[PDB]
Design a protein around this ligand. Structure first.
Ligand SMILES: COc1ccc(Cl)cc1C(=O)NCCc1ccc(S(=O)(=O)NC(=O)NC2CCCCC2)cc1
Ligand SMILES: Nc1ncnc2c1ncn2[C@@H]1O[C@H](COP(=O)(O)OP(=O)(O)OP(=O)(O)O)[C@@H](O)[C@H]1O
Lengths: 61, 239
C-alpha cells in the first residue's frame, strides 16, 4: 500500500557503466526488413481505412 | 548590401536601470571576419547577446535585413559563448546537433579542429558519452568541441566569443586560426570572431572596437591604423 509516495531521493543517481562509457547505446536491435510475400507463400500486408461494406445474412450460410 | 545587421540604439541594457550599451551604431559586413576586440571588462559579450536578441533594448531601432533579409532575425545564427554548453550525448551527436549526417563535413571539421588524439584516447571514440553526467574533459577540449559544433552547420551567419582564450596553448590558437582560414574562407559564411589577443587579425574585413562603448566604424585595418588613433596602432603592434 502506497510504496514510494515519499519521492525525495532522485536527480543524483549517477550514470551507470553502460551510460557514461556508452556501452548501452550500441543498440544493434534493428527490426527485420519488411517482406512483401512470406516464405510460406502467404502475402502479408496491412490494408487500412477500407470502407466497411457491412455484413450480409448470406455470410452465415 | 554587405551590412548584415543594423542598429542605432540609444540604450540596450540588462535588467532595468542605467544603460550598459548606451549610444551605439554598428554594421556587420557580409562574408566578413569582424574582429570585435577591446579592453576586457565592458561591451563585447553583451553586444553580441543584445544583437542575438536577449537583452532589454531600451532605445533600439528594429533593423535586420540580410541578403534577401524579415520576421525576428528570420534565420539561425550559430553561436558559442565564453562558457561552453554540451549535450549529455555522444560526441558525434553533440557535434551534429540535429542535422543531416555528412562524413565530408564532419571529417573536415574534425580535421580542422585538431581534436583527433582526444577522440582516439577516449574509450569509444566519437561514440563516447561526454559532458556532465559522463566522462569529464579539460577546458580546451570543451572549447574545441563547442567551436566545432558551431562550425559544422548550415548557417551563413556565425558568431564566436573568445574561442582561443581557454585553448590548450597559443600553438593550438594558431592551429584554430589555420582551420578557420581553411574551412570558413572556403565558404561565404559571415563570421564575427572575438578574442582578447590582437595578433590574429588576418584578412580583417572589419574591426569593431569597444571601450565603454563603440569607438569607430568596422573599417579596414589600413584606414584604422591612422584614423587619429595612433595609440591603437602602437598597442596592437607592440604586443
Ligand atoms: C491503496 O490506497 C488506498 C487504500 C485504502 C483506501 Cl481507503 C484508500 C486508498 C487510496 O486513496 N489510494 C489512492 C489511489 C492509489 C491507490 C493505489 C496505488 S498503487 O497501485 O499501490 N501505487 C501505484 O500504482 N504507483 C504507480 C507507479 C508510479 C506512479 C504512478 C502510479 C496508487 C494510487
Ligand atoms: N549575463 C549577464 N547578466 C548580467 N550582467 C552581465 C552578464 N554578462 C555580463 N554582465 C555584466 O555586464 C558588464 C558588461 O559585460 P561584457 O559582456 O562587456 O563582459 P566582457 O567584456 O565580455 O568580459 P569578458 O570578455 O571578460 O567576459 C560586465 O561588467 C558584467 O559584469
Amino acid at each position: 500500500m502506497l510504496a514510494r509516495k515519499s519521492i525525495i531521493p532522485e536527480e543524483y543517481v549517477l550514470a551507470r557503466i553502460a551510460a557514461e562509457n556508452l556501452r548501452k547505446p550500441r543498440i544493434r536491435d534493428r527490426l527485420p526488413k519488411a517482406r512483401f510475400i512470406a516464405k510460406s507463400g502467404a502475402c502479408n500486408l496491412a490494408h487500412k481505412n477500407i470502407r466497411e461494406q457491412g455484413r450480409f445474412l448470406q455470410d452465415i450460410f | 548590401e554587405d551590412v548584415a545587421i543594423k542598429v542605432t540604439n540609444g540604450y540596450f541594457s540588462w535588467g532595468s536601470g542605467l544603460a550598459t550599451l548606451s549610444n551605439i551604431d554598428i554594421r556587420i559586413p557580409t562574408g566578413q571576419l569582424t574582429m570585435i576586440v577591446g579592453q576586457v571588462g565592458c561591451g563585447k559579450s553583451s553586444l553580441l547577446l543584445a544583437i542575438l536578441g536577449e537583452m532589454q533594448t531600451l532605445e533600439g531601432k528594429v533593423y535586420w535585413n540580410n541578403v534577401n533579409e524579415r520576421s525576428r532575425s528570420r534565420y539561425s545564427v550559430a553561436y558559442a559563448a565564453q562558457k561552453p554548453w554540451l549535450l549529455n550525448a555522444t560526441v558525434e551527436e553533440n557535434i551534429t546537433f540535429g542535422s543531416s549526417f555528412n562524413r565530408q563535413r564532419y571529417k573536415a571539421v574534425t580535421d580542422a579542429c585538431s581534436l583527433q588524439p582526444d577522440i582516439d584516447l577516449l574509450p569509444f571514440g566519437d561514440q563516447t558519452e561526454i559532458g556532465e553526467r559522463g566522462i569529464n574533459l579539460s577546458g580546451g577540449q570543451r572549447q574545441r568541441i563547442c567551436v566545432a559544433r558551431a562550425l559544422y552547420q548550415n548557417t551563413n551567419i556565425v558568431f564566436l566569443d573568445d574561442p582561443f582564450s581557454a585553448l590548450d596553448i597559443h600553438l593550438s590558437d594558431h592551429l584554430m586560426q589555420e582551420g578557420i582560414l581553411k574551412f570558413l574562407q572556403d565558404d561565404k559564411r559571415t563570421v564575427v570572431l572575438v578574442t582578447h589577443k590582437l595578433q590574429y587579425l588576418t584578412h580583417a574585413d572589419w574591426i569593431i572596437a569597444m571601450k565603454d562603448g563603440s569607438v569607430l566604424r568596422e573599417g579596414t585595418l589600413k584606414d584604422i591604423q591612422t584614423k587619429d588613433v595612433e595609440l591603437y596602432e602602437h598597442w596592437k603592434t607592440l604586443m
